[model samples]
Target: KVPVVGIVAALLPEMGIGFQGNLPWRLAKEMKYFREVTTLTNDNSKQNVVIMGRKTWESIPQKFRPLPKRINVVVSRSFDGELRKVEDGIYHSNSLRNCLTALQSSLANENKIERIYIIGGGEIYRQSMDLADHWLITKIMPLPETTIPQMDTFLQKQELEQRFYDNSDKLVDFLPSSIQLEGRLTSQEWNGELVKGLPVQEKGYQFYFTLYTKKLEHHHHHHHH
Candidate 1:
């Protein structure tokens, strides 16, 4: 089976994901969580894949552009024909589907890729929502009466919630059975043992990690059998 495509992002209650081409908060631990979740694999021999738009690619720290262990795929409409490898573990594609197809093709046999994730800019997140199989979200909290940063980019979180609610058939029943007001994520797939679920304080910011899977339809339904 093809690897699951997940969306990873840190957003405010209002869904503000970016401000002036950058993440508004500076939480090193939160970033560490992002790195670990995207880096880990059940099979150590296989690498994970992270897809992003050219803008998001550029926004990453230059030293971390290829993002270390993961294969990085940057999508840009400006790229002409074929999906091409820019360097070791770095790729350029003209579209999202092209990148996904190329990675799933036999040509990518050398990579031995496992899980896939969409690490985004506003445009890429909006475009990939329907195709995403899971959501790994970092909800950042703010202090009351504090001046809110000016946000220029956002994720359509309401629409995402609406879709989840509409799907009566849920994915893995791995969601935490009960809310923990002060603890970490409970899902094993998300490095739950290490990532905090309750808001954590860092660099004057508070944030917590959470996961949501896309509900899937059952294939073989019995009619009054």
Candidate 2:
């Protein structure tokens, strides 16, 4: 039970994501939704924060490293460097949990953040699965004869085991008992329409816009909030 961490990602038919440390495809609407949702916050006094593993944060162009207007927090044990090096930013934390909890305290910031979004590459997603509450995932349906390249289908079984444990050497269930560890699932009504049947055709490929949240009894199970 931490701050409601929302996740936004794009996945291929085979749950394939990434080729060179970046998104494999570009969908105008999906990117738009990501920017809008992640950047939106109830309080104008305090900007929203986005947490990602170190590599995920560095994967972006140096010009957009801090991702303008938001508090960019790179949460990683390996990403041990001070946040002071990140321009126009100050404050540091050991992990995403520390980052979120610090922002909640009045001593840290002027206003308490209502929410935080976990937009990821891989390790951060798996490491923080159960801690997240809402999901906005775009499912990419590859077209016939559409030659595509994917470098890393999903988290390795070994990596899953290694990352699930805490620094204290205790196993942590980042995933709930009902959800598979590396499930690329999203089910729920986007406004009024069912997402699965509403696959939107994009340039040279097709994609389905689906969203989910922790309130569901099971992962991939369908219902609306």
Candidate 3:
């Protein structure tokens, strides 16, 4: 079975995620929350998976490469060295769809993958907007005396939200308009506590985390004749 696919990102007021190939802000609190959310797993026997574009993977400081505990997969087509080998537990795929396909197979079960997270650079996020099951977005607000930073990479927030509404057709499973950001997730399946709510002040930046889940019907396969 395919695990939950969540897209994780921190966006600037301009919906900018990266500047000059790196994050423009140095937000410790936000970064910590990201680590916690992605690193956490319900079962001790399984690990979460993080998929990112090659640029995003390279942006991580060399010391933090392959991000500590979770399985790391990078998406890239032009790379020369290796195709799709697990080099030191890191998997490389040529495209987002291919990476996801591999995850749906035994590579996921065999590796004990509990959840799948898309940690991004703009390109990966752009490709995953429709395919993602949920979005874990950190909307950053500029503080007094600070101005919006210049960005070379951006996430199309408007289009993403619009698609959310377009894909949802059922009224019974309609998603709530508001999401609780500071506490536990409303869903019964999630056990991890989210970071405290809104206007999170750190390094003179304000931001809040919000989750948007796609509403869809599920079919239970357990049947005994």
Candidate 4:
């Protein structure tokens, strides 16, 4: 079975997700949100699979590897032909398509993965966006541009705007921009059902957290059983 894909992130103005190997800001609440959304499972017997790049995987603290109960996978292309290694719940190996395909056969029945979510660091996000069936983005509007000199609240977001800026591209064309509603997205695509808003005093900007689910797929049942 082809697993559903979801691109998840908290992005800034320039679409810059990483500058020096980490997230732009220190939003603990947002981090909690990430954990909840990625790990939340309706079935206790199943788990949500979060696929991220090697760098994003490494950026996570050692103790937090594999993200606890969820099936955390980090993909890369330079593993010396040693496809996969699952030591401590973290699957380290293979390309996106290959790994996902293998996972469907191996885990879909026993592990019963609830859903597949794409977590990332730019390049990985770009590579997997096409496969994404759902998009869960937390747009940080009035988007921050800089930090307060001695803080960990800044990435290359400002530079991204300077590099490949697009005013119409929902949240720009760069942590990423794949915002489309119905058939086409517009400047109004920014309009999202408000979930929560946070003060940016710690990171120096204010933003709202919103979610976008894919349009429902039509299903027809054959009553033969």
Candidate 5:
């Protein structure tokens, strides 16, 4: 019953998310934080799944095209034909409902999976906001002066249940007691020029990866001891 939805974001002092499909500020430390949070798992043998929008998928370099070690699910309305052949790892869908259904079915059939990581490109994050069990957000402090276009607008649409909603309004309130070890790797080296005339920087920039978990609750009936 636990559908773990993790969100990685870079926020401004005002908790804004992006400046044109990327982080507003440049705190390299947060990049390290993003990578660490994403690799956290119950066991090493357990593999996680990553869900995202087409633009988010495009953001990743082609060499890294099917993200290694994780099942990649891309949500889009116009994916078919040649696109499907480009990479076997990319699973396409038009809506969240379809994607979730596929994810559920895949997990049910594959016994090796332990969790799912919902990576994003705005729309995917917005659609999954309500269904998320835990939220892993990178709350950047000392708000920057520049306007961040990537604010978490999905936050407004979230329906916080009385049982799961943490009452603290402060950013630090949600901080994990200790940093969890996920994995470590060097930064990705970008190619010198744009591919196919697409501005890779704007269309494929890499920002800090934040981690968020959706709260999951369970109900059971039993006799008192």
Candidate 6:
């Protein structure tokens, strides 16, 4: 079976993705948000996999190059033997299909393997978005008062489905009754443990933790756009 692709990303007030190679907007809360979402795991004793493009890999600090335990698959056409030497476990592929094939093979042959997460730069995310199942999005509420310089294109809704898991408490009062009615109420028992917290920092930036599962329909795609 094809693994679930978890997309973890942050956007600016205008819903823009990245300016250059980094997230366009900066927020201390967003750091927490990012960490919380990426660390989520499932019941099969499996750790989520993180796939990224060459630029995204470079964006990460050298010290954290081989993210412990989790599979770190890097997609790049330019990476050579010398670069791979820097990190032992890092896997490289020139295209998405090859990457996915390698990922499946690794999991099948390896003893411990679980879910997959696609952490990225713009091009990587754009190309892999259709393959993702559930989108764990953190919509900046009330829209920040200041205007951030428009960097890239806005994310479209038709591309995926979303359910606001957190940050809804703050919106309860100001939001209309209909809006409040729209929010989902997950049972407390649904909360389960996935990954244990560990600090892995690179270039002064820290990775966030969060867990998600892919919806059924997202697995199959018939059209080419």
lDDT of 3: 0.67
Q: What is the full ranking by lDDT, best candidate first? A: 1, 3, 4, 2, 5, 6
Could you tell me every candidate's TM-score relative to the true structure? 0.78, 0.66, 0.76, 0.65, 0.60, 0.59
Using TM-score as the measure, name the better of candidate 5 and candidate 6: 5
Ranking by TM-score: 1, 3, 2, 4, 5, 6
What ranges in model 2 sit over 4 Å off?
A: 1-3, 78-86, 90-92, 153-199, 215-225
Better of 4 and 5 by TM-score: 4
Question: By TM-score, how accurate is candidate 2?
Answer: 0.66
Please report, as a residue range, the 10-residue window in candidate 4 with the lowest summed lDDT. 174-183
CA lDDT of 77 in candidate 5?
77
lDDT of 2: 0.55
Which digits, one per residue and each the tens of the lDDT, describe model 5 over residues 1-225?
435665655332344555455555565555555444444445576666677778777766678668766667776777643222235655566666655655566455365556667777666666666556665654333323434344433332234233234322322333333453332322332233111100111222333233333355566766899
Clashes of each: 1, 0, 0, 1, 17, 11
Count of clashes in candidate 5: 17
Give the C-alpha miss distance for residue 98 in model 3, angstroms: 2.1
Candidate 3, residues 1-225, lDDT tens digits: the string is: 655555555555457788899887888878877887777766777788898888888899999888888888887887533337668868877778766766778853686887888988787888887677767676676677777677788887776766553221221132222212243322111124233223466766666665566656579787889
Cα displacement (angstroms), candidate 6, residue 190, comes to 28
177: Cα error in model 5, Å: 13
- Supply candidate 5's per-residue lDDT for 27: 59
lDDT of 1 by residue, 75-152 (tens): 888986557887898888898976777777766556577677888878888877677767767766565555667778
lDDT of 5: 0.50
